[PDB]
Amino acid sequence: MRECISIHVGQAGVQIGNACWELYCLEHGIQPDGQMPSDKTIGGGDDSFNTFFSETGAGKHVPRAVFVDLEPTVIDEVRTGTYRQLFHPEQLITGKEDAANNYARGHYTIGKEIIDLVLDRIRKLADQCTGLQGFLVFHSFGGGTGSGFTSLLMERLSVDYGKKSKLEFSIYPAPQVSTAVVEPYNSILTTHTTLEHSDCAFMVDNEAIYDICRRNLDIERPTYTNLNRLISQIVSSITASLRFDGALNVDLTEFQTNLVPYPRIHFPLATYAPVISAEKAYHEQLSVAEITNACFEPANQMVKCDPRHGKYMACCLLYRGDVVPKDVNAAIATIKTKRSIQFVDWCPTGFKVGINYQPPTVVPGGDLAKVQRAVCMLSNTTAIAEAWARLDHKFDLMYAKRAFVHWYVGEGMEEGEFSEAREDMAALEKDYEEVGVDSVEGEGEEEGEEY
Amino acid sequence: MREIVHIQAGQCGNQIGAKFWEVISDEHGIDPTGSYHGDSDLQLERINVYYNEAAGNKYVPRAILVDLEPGTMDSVRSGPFGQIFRPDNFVFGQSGAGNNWAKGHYTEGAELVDSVLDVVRKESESCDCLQGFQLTHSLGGGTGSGMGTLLISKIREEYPDRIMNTFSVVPSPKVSDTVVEPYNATLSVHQLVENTDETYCIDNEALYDICFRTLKLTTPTYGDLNHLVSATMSGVTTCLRFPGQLNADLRKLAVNMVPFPRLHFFMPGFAPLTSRGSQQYRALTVPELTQQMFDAKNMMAACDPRHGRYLTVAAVFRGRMSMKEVDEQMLNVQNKNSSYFVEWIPNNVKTAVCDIPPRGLKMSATFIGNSTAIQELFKRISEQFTAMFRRKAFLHWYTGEGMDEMEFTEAESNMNDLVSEYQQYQDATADEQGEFEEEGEEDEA
Numbered sequence: 001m002r003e004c005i006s007i008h009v010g011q012a013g014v015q016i017g018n019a020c021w022e023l024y025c026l027e028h029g030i031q032p033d034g035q036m037p038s039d040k041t042i043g044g045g046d047d048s049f050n051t052f053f054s055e056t057g058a059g060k061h062v063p064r065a066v067f068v069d070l071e072p073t074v075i076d077e078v079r080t081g082t083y084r085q086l087f088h089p090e091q092l093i094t095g096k097e098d099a100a101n102n103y104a105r106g107h108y109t110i111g112k113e114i115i116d117l118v119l120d121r122i123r124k125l126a127d128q129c130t131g132l133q134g135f136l137v138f139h140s141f142g143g144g145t146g147s148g149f150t151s152l153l154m155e156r157l158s159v160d161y162g163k164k165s166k167l168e169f170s171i172y173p174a175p176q177v178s179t180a181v182v183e184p185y186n187s188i189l190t191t192h193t194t195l196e197h198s199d200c201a202f203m204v205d206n207e208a209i210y211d212i213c214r215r216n217l218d219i220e221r222p223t224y225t226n227l228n229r230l231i232s233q234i235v236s237s238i239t240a241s242l243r244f245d246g247a248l249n250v251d252l253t254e255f256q257t258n259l260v261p262y263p264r265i266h267f268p269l270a271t272y273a274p275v276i277s278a279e280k281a282y283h284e285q286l287s288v289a290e291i292t293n294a295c296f297e298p299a300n301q302m303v304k305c306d307p308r309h310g311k312y313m314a315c316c317l318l319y320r321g322d323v324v325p326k327d328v329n330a331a332i333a334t335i336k337t338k339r340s341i342q343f344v345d346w347c348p349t350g351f352k353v354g355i356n357y358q359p360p361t362v363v364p365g366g367d368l369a370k371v372q373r374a375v376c377m378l379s380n381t382t383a384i385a386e387a388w389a390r391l392d393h394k395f396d397l398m399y400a401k402r403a404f405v406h407w408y409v410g411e412g413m414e415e416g417e418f419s420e421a422r423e424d425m426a427a428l429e430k431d432y433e434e435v436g437v438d439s440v441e442g443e444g445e446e447e448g449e450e451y
Numbered sequence: 452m453r454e455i456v457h458i459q460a461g462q463c464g465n466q467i468g469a470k471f472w473e474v475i476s477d478e479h480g481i482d483p484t485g486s487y488h489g490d491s492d493l494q495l496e497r498i499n500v501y502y503n504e505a506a507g508n509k510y511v512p513r514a515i516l517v518d519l520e521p522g523t524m525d526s527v528r529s530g531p532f533g534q535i536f537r538p539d540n541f542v543f544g545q546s547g548a549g550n551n552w553a554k555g556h557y558t559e560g561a562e563l564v565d566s567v568l569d570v571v572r573k574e575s576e577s578c579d580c581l582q583g584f585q586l587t588h589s590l591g592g593g594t595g596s597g598m599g600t601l602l603i604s605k606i607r608e609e610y611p612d613r614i615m616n617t618f619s620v621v622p623s624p625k626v627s628d629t630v631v632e633p634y635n636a637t638l639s640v641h642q643l644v645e646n647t648d649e650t651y652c653i654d655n656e657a658l659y660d661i662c663f664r665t666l667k668l669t670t671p672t673y674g675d676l677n678h679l680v681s682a683t684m685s686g687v688t689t690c691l692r693f694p695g696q697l698n699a700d701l702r703k704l705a706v707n708m709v710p711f712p713r714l715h716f717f718m719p720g721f722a723p724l725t726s727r728g729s730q731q732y733r734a735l736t737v738p739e740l741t742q743q744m745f746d747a748k749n750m751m752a753a754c755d756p757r758h759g760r761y762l763t764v765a766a767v768f769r770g771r772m773s774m775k776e777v778d779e780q781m782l783n784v785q786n787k788n789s790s791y792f793v794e795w796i797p798n799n800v801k802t803a804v805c806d807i808p809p810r811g812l813k814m815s816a817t818f819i820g821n822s823t824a825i826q827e828l829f830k831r832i833s834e835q836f837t838a839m840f841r842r843k844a845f846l847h848w849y850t851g852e853g854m855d856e857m858e859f860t861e862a863e864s865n866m867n868d869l870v871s872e873y874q875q876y877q878d879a880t881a882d883e884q885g886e887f888e889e890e891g892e893e894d895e896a
């Protein structure tokens with residue numbers, strides 16, 4: 001019937017890729033070599049695992065995926081691990097030498113070595129899909145390959161598959177945490193490419209997701225492994241209505257307005273609920289009201305910016321499990337009452353809602369709350385402005401001393417190209433500001449429309 | 452795949468490599484003959500980054516042995532692991548450098564080097580994918596400074612896209628090893644400053660401090676120091692050699708570590724360094740480790756980094772640890788010790804994390820730091836080059852070797868241009884003023 005594709009680029013992408021395909025094979029009861037050991041089908045039904053798994057051979061199913069870093073070692077671990085037999089080996093591409101946290105290597109001098117290989121494998125992947133809906137993509141946005149190559153890939157899909165849903169999920173840099181020094185430059189060089197090409201861009205954050213894990217989930221010293229298995233619950237949830245039946249669904253062609261209030265602003269925040277320990281869910285019980293109110297709390301968002309400093313613009317709520325619309329619709333009313341939430345004046349109809357029947361599949365060993373009835377929330381807010389306003393200043397600080405410029409120049413970018421990116425970043429700053437008013441006047445909101 | 456070539460120049464450099472190759476071999480569990488029976492497949496699956504597989508299940512290191520004398524080589528061939536080396540990679544003189552850079556770089560090595568470059572070529576073509584060229588040597592003596600320059604020169608021409616790296620020993624602040632050590636340490640650097648991507652400043656006086664003060668060694672010796680040194684060389688490569696939660700090779704570190712193209716002269720350091728007398732009274736945690744990373748005294752170089760500011764730092768953690776515990780500890784030091792850091796490089800940290808711990812520890816952390824405080828080396832050596840050169844000491848030894856004192860003058864001039872560039876970026880503001888000029892014309896109309 002229909003298909004999504006799954007793209008992991010750079011070491012964070014890849015690592016998250018061991019996490020989301022692990023979860024997808026729990027949630028469908030697929031064992032680590034592609035067999036479905038409890039299959040029941042009539043054949044040719046729905047059965048929506050076929051949107052994420054291509055059936056091979058005798059009943060090997062195969063993730064609809066591709067992976068790369070230009071370092072071998074990170075893809076060699078997928079080639080060697082628990083699920084090594086899950087992948088078709090021509091999914092697992094690598095390079096000779098990492099993109100070295102320089103975007104320029106990922107987009108020019110090293111990335112050219114793997115691109116038309118990468119695309120030939122995807123041509124082959126999409127040639128096998130019956131009604132390709134789009135591409136969902138994890139990448140190291142601040143990295144070398146996660147920055148340069150994902151954005152080279154975006155430009156090189158968009159010329160062929162321009163009508164497909166082009167969706168991506170970064171890791172974003174953080175207000176006090178820092179994993180690398182040039183992280184901001186690559187963040188701008190990639191935003192400056194993928195703003196022309198991507199249909200949405202789902203930003204999430206380590207420094208944010210730690211605090212939720214040490215607070216809520218009550219994980220004492222979280223790992224990157226813990227983290228990738230939590231981050232996995234956003235794409236899981238926004239795919240639940242591509243993987244199971246519900247009372248209300250979405251498709252990929254829905255999120256690209258219901259999370260995109262005007263096109264340049266394709267940047268929502270996300271979270272998932274309830275996110276608590278065993279001992280806590282044992283102790284105390286939660287309802288679909290409480291779990292809708294928790295998705296609006298500052299301490300609960302997977303990006304560090306406080307929603308209060310801004311205003312909401314677009315929202316998607318994705319209910320899984322044992323819940324009914326008559327409760328859910330009154331629980332959004334709640335969020336409609338408390339003026340501690342402010343939406344923008346342009347968005348009085350700001351909620352979009354979907355309701356799938358399948359509960360979240362309980363993890364191995366039962367290490368999570370035993371809640372049959374969990375919720376994902378995803379929102380576009382003006383509060384992201386205060387997370388970009390640090391990043392674009394971190395560029396202004398280093399580029400005044402031309403600090404590290406010479407590696408970019410080293411691989412073949414010119415000072416013209418970092419300056420052009422930076423002036424669209426001061427333009428992005430202006431596009432966050434066009435909604436900074438009540439005004440209806442016809443270039444921001446239309447004088448002949450009524451909400 | 453990604454495969455580093457090692458060189459070991461002169462007596463000093465040879466003995467650091469001679470320790471290096473007991474030490475990484477042990478980490479990969481290698482038998483002193485170049486065989487293997489060791490306990491892990493992971494250990495052997497990755498080794499290639501520093502080894503070649505000779506026929507019938509055998510292992511050779513990608514090592515070149517370099518010396519203008521018959522001395523120190525004879526001891527590597529008799530020592531622990533002396534058997535792993537390809538006998539062909541010993542290409543050697545019968546003259547020495549005489550503590551003299553120009554005898555290395557324009558006489559005795561100049562006569563030998565094309566016979567050594569022929570091994571460098573053959574190992575570079577026997578690589579899968581050639582990654583870099585690492586050197587153990589010194590800068591204050593004659594052979595590793597002088598021959599090693601001449602190699603670097605000739606290899607940096609041939610292979611311009613590969614990383615070019617130098618694990619150098621450098622002259623100590625108070626008592627000397629050889630008298631010409633400031634000439635040597637100027638003339639070699641007058642080649643290396645535009646022929647390396649990375650270079651190290653290892654002060655054996657600080658190793659002697661860390662050997663008595665932290666490690667609590669009674670009789671501390673080169674036996675010790677070349678372990679402490681080689682720990683750092685295997686330790687920086689752990690995120691290429693082995694899996695972990697953050698893989699990161701040497702060039703991925705270098706792009707983050709070097710802001711401006713001559714600021715590449717690094718401060719090394721390791722944790723933990725707790726003695727056998729103290730293990731049972733200390734814990735081995737990321738707080739305790741990150742404490743000893745940034746303790747002045749633990750610094751394997753010439754100065755406390757608080758005679759300057761950190762342009763950049765990189766932490767290469769080893770063993771199973773919470774990336775959150777790491778990230779929090781690197782965030783605490785940036786915000787409690789913010790006066791230690793350069794303010795227009797907004798956050799100064801690169802982080803990497805290997806799953807594999809070194810032998811006999813719960814966890815460790817290798818540290819690369821770049822502080823403007825490394826001018827404490829270059830203020831000394833430029834002065835100490837001048838003090839002897841100003842009365843023309845020792846000079847005929849080097850101008851017997853195809854020198855003119857215009858190259859001595861030109862080079863101490865370059866070292867002033869360097870220490871002045873390093874000061875130019877010291878204490879510079881994160882803010883840059885506008886004007887007080889006025890728009891339009893000024894009337895009350």
Ligand SMILES: Nc1nc2c(ncn2[C@@H]2O[C@H](COP(=O)(O)OP(=O)(O)OP(=O)(O)O)[C@@H](O)[C@H]2O)c(=O)[nH]1
Nearest residue numbers: 010011012015098099100101140143144145146179
């Ligand atoms: N959440 C999370 N973040 C990660 C993970 N791995 C890396 N990161 C983040 O992504 C950034 C980039 O990682 P890199 O290893 O540099 O990614 P890369 O794209 O492979 O970069 P190159 O190796 O230079 O190509 C890091 O600095 C971290 O902020 C992971 O598994 N999970």
Ligand SMILES: Nc1nc2c(ncn2[C@@H]2O[C@H](COP(=O)(O)OP(=O)(O)O)[C@@H](O)[C@H]2O)c(=O)[nH]1
Nearest residue numbers: 461462463466548550589591592593594595628
């Ligand atoms: N760390 C270290 N330093 C050494 C060693 N042997 C000598 N040195 C130092 O390194 C320098 C000599 O380097 P070398 O190239 O062998 O010089 P040459 O003997 O003058 O040709 C002097 O500063 C010595 O103190 C050693 O094994 N380890």
Ligand SMILES: [Mg+2]
Nearest residue numbers: 069070098145
């Ligand atoms: Mg990479």
